[PDB]
A paper describes a structure:
The prenylated flavin (prFMN)-dependent ferulic acid decarboxylases (Fdc) catalyse reversible non-oxidative (de)carboxylation of a range of acrylic acids with extended conjugation. The final step in the pathway consists of the decarboxylation of 3-methylcrotonic acid, catalysed by an evolved ferulic acid decarboxylase (Fdc) enzyme. Herein, we report on discovery and optimization through directed evolution of Fdc decarboxylation activity with 3-methylcrotonic acid to produce isobutene. Recently, a reversible 1,3-dipolar cycloaddition mechanism was conclusively shown to underpin catalysis in Aspergillus niger Fdc (AnFdc).
To further understand how the architecture of the active site affects the decarboxylation of 3-methylcrotonic acid, corresponding key mutations from TaFdcV were introduced in AnFdc. Two variants were studied: AnFdc T395M (AnFdcI) and the triple mutant AnFdc T395M R435P P438W (AnFdcII). Overlay of the AnFdc wild-type and TaFdcV crystal structures reveals a downward shift of the Y404 residue in TaFdcV in the secondary shell compared to the corresponding Y394 in AnFdc. The Y394 residue is unaffected in the AnFdcI variant compared to wild-type. In contrast, the active site of the AnFdcII variant matches that of TaFdcV in the conformation of Y394 and M395. As expected, neither AnFdcI nor AnFdcII were active with cinnamic acid, likely due to a clash between the substrate phenyl ring and M395. While binding of crotonic acid in AnFdc wild-type cannot be detected by the UV–Vis spectra over 2-h incubation, both mutants AnFdcI and AnFdcII readily bind the inhibitor, evident from UV–Vis spectra, demonstrating increased selectivity towards smaller substrates. Additional mutations in AnFdcII and TaFdcII led to a substantial further increase of 18 and 81 fold, respectively, in isobutene production. Surprisingly, the in vitro titer obtained with TaFdcII was slightly higher than the corresponding TaFdcV levels obtained. Thus, the 4 point mutations in TaFdcII (F404Y, T405M, V445P, Q448W) and 3 point mutations in AnFdcII (T395M, R435P, P438W), that create an active site architecture identical to TaFdcV, appear largely responsible for the increased isobutene activity compared to wild-type TaFdc and AnFdc.
Author numbering:
A (entry chain A): 4 to 507
B (entry chain B): 5 to 499
The structure:
């Protein structure tokens, strides 16, 4: 099976890339597995595979940490993401995001039902499992529970059957056969939960699949449009129909090679304590438990020697930064272009902790619109901040054609030197705000409203006649023949060059 | 020793394996600057150009990147440390503490010596032509050959009670003139104005290149109005600086200066100046203005004289390491003298030295029983109405958990703890720095406003204390488990 279509092959691909460390000695799921994974994420080291978890029983379970985190080397920085998508390990973020957007204007490819798969190799009914006895990790010391669900895919269907959504939302063990987790607007798991709640007849049929086809977990993290079944979008992106098997206890379909599957119901009535949790912005607030949605587990099915993927999320750099920010920025790029805004590129700089998106403007098309910064800022803000894809982003930085928005240092340079504080920004107080950012939910203002800004790092001539500066850098302040002579004599003179394929 | 003599400083860079000697012919027209620019962009070894095309009777060799960064994290600031008699592993906290140390010490006045190495050679008006010397063209669109990027201007108040040492750019105008920036609120401009109001004579002036490294650090620091830099450097180094009188005026220059120009700064004349590739990383090729005009009457120089050169622009060069860091040092001291609970200040390099992050002693903040709106306003009023705050447009207030010397920690705090609009106070009625592109080439007044105080303190920091832990390796795992993970790291297969 290809690495992008089967988590078990993905684990083998990381091993062949020399991008895996197999830890075969006993590791405690109480903090130790997550501490090692956290250190990996903070240093961009190899992904840890914990083959010997204290408490593993009857093949449940091994843990792969850091499945979507960065590699140390600059050349294959994004190689773990590339391996989710059948891209070369050297793929740029522009190439990864173009791949994730490619299904946007293609016919969906419906999944194929198969009679069985590896995910049916072992099963436990409700009398045979206890979620409190599995080696579920405690990820951060102050977490309000053991977060089993950090990199699995929730599967829920609209009541009329026309929309099946795949998405990542966190969940923790509540008791032997229940989870609690975040089911929040405007997320699709929440939109579908509300349809079931308004019908008022039944709890939501639900499955949670861990170790799904890597291309599916990428779509699970991406805010593709309302009403669009992720499975058909992934089929189109990969050029292949995904193989799905029916759940034993409900009529939902799960990827045939899923490592671990939970089958059950998401309650339309019951809640339970959820959180706190060490989250994407780099914080945990220990005194901070709230009521979350409650999931009932009726059955567990799993592969022989099942592997549970785990995100030890927090400060830079993990799955919450590489996948949440980047895939939101991709969808924002597409939204801008569909609203006839001259945006070529979007990226959420890691330095912003997933809270900014930098929009690269085609200034030739900006010049033809004959507008001003005040008018253009309002127009961009009103599109992005009134769409689901803009929900988690609080600052948009508009930059011209000379800025590579995939390079955080170039975005911070442009922001610091081209955006006059106050005058070149528009504040948005009457838009949905993201409560999870500390300055929102733990801040001086409304938790769920405003706190957003459009910052124009376009210089005045970019709107009229064109760029009227040169960078004071090696590339732009010296002629081509001189630069080539300096590069050709660099090591000869006794300076050193960073080797593209080796340097960190 | 290195901190008292530029020639010994070059020798120290050699011992540190932090110098590349280039003995093949190098063109001062862009090539020396292009090599220096690439050094600064990659944190490579400082280039010493021993063989410039057009060198004339020992004028001159060039040292590039004298105050730029080293590649290794262990000795990142070692080229700065070597200006100040600190170890090459010195932290930015230790460098800035050294630079502030002389603030509450008695000045040590300089010692006058009859002669020194800077007198080894001399050229009167008939003997030199500035247009025939190997002065660098530093960027292809510069409006002139900028001879002056790392020399010290020396001017004195009319009443003789204040002698100022400072860096300001100057370019060759003709055989015996320079043009340069003399701009408020800078001390060269303050002293210029004193002579203008007197109305009687041009300003006696000297420009010394390759001065005692400790003096070029004080030359780039905004020490208070009226304070003679020589006496400040004396107190900081615990020694009296050795100065020699100029041949053609009564100003005193460091005895070991590589190259000295003696003459006058005109109170009446101007000439075209710029454009120049500048500290924010831009040049606007359409952009010549009338600048101050200097007349050179005499050149004295060492045998085998070395001209230091800043090839300034995008990160990282002397304009970032020295201008931002030394301004941030003075702002820290200014805050403490105004009874503000600031422990540390630094201008993150990511901000292109437009931001300063102020680390707050939050125990002292809680005892003040204040709010964000009040505290931001007090901090901005102090810093943005002072010369030391002139070049800084954004102040970021952070609590005790943030290392302000780490740009990644400042950017994290800024991005996660400061709500846009609500947690910020804009300042429009304060002097603004025209050289930042968004000011002089922007949508608003070039010399006014565009400043902000961004409060990245969380609400409980003002009241009861921090109510979070970072979701990081340091804070979300117990000490015994962190130690076990670090002890077993290489044994498990990690690097
Ligand atoms: C990759 C990734 C994404 C998410 C999460 C995580 C990872 C690793 C956690 C580690 C579990 C932390 C948590 O913040 N988490 C998370 C979350 N969205 C939520 O509503 N709730 C969550 O608890 N997203 C983002 C969502 O997956 C995307 O916003 C996606 O677009 C949703 O799909 P849809 O609603 O658009 O179908
Ligand atoms: C280290 C350094 C400092 C400065 C400069 C450079 C270097 C390398 C140039 C490469 C020449 C570029 C130019 O931007 N430049 C420069 C300048 N200040 C000016 O008014 N004008 C200038 O043209 N400063 C900053 C000043 O040296 C400090 O602000 C100092 O505090 C002033 O001294 P004082 O007036 O406080 O005595
Ligand atoms: K999704
Ligand atoms: K602007
Ligand atoms: K000075
Ligand atoms: K106050
Ligand atoms: K704040
Ligand atoms: Mn969806
Ligand atoms: Mn001064």
């Amino acid at each position: 099976q290809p690495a992008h279509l089967c988590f078990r092959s993905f684990v083998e691909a990381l091993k062949v890339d020399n991008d895996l460390v197999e830890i075969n000695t006993p590791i405690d799921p109480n903090l130790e597995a997550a501490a090692i994974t956290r250190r990996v994420c903070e240093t961009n080291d190899k992904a840890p595979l914990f083959n010997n978890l204290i408490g593993m029983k009857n093949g449940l379970f091994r843990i792969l940490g850091a499945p979507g985190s960065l590699r140390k080397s600059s050349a294959d920085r994004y190689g773990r993401l590339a391996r989710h998508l059948a891209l070369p390990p050297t793929a740029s973020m522009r190439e990864i995001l173009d791949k994730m957007l490619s299904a946007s204007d293609m016919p969906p490819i419906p999944p194929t039902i198969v009679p069985t798969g590896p995910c049916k190799e072992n099963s436990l009914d409700d009398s045979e499992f206890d979620l409190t006895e599995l080696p579920v990790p405690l990820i951060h010391k102050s977490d309000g529970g053991k977060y089993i669900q950090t990199y699995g895919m929730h599967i829920v269907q609209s009541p009329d059957g026309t929309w099946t959504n795949w998405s990542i939302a966190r969940a923790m063990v509540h008791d032997k056969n229940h989870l609690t987790g975040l089911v929040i607007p405007p997320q699709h798991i929440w939109q579908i939960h509300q349809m079931w709640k308004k019908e008022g007849r039944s709890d939501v049929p639900w499955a949670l699949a861990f170790g799904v086809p890597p291309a599916a977990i990428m779509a699970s993290s991406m805010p593709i449009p309302d009403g669009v079944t992720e499975a058909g979008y992934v089929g189109a992106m990969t050029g292949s129909s995904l193989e799905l098997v029916k759940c034993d206890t409900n009529d939902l379909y799960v990827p045939a090679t899923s490592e671990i599957v939970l089958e059950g119901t998401l309650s339309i009535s019951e809640t339970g304590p959820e959180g706190p949790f060490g989250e994407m912005h780099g914080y945990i607030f220990p005194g901070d438990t709230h009521l979350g949605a409650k999931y009932k587990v009726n059955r567990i099915t799993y592969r022989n020697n099942a592997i549970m993927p785990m995100s030890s999320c927090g400060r830079l750099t993990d799955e919450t930064h590489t996948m949440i920010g980047s895939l939101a920025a991709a969808e924002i790029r597409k939204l801008c272009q569909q609203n006839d805004l001259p945006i070529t590129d979007a990226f959420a700089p890691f330095e912003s902790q997933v809270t900014w998106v930098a929009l690269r403007v085609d200034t030739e098309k900006l010049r033809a619109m004959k507008t001003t910064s005040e008018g253009f800022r309002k127009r961009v803000g009103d599109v992005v901040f009134n769409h689901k894809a803009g929900y988690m982003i609080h600052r948009l930085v508009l930059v011209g054609d000379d800025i590579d928005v995939y390079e955080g240092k170039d975005v911070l340079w442009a922001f610091s030197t081209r955006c006059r504080p106050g005058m070149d920004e528009t504040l948005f107080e009457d838009v949905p705000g993201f409560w999870l950012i500390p300055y929102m939910g733990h801040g001086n203002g409304p938790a769920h409203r405003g706190g957003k800004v459009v910052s124009d790092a376009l210089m005045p001539t970019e709107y009229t006649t064109g760029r009227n500066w040169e960078a004071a850098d090696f590339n732009q302040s010296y002629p081509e023949d001189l630069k080539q002579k300096v590069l050709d004599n660099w090591t000869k003179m006794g300076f050193s060059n960073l080797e593209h394929h080796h340097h960190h």
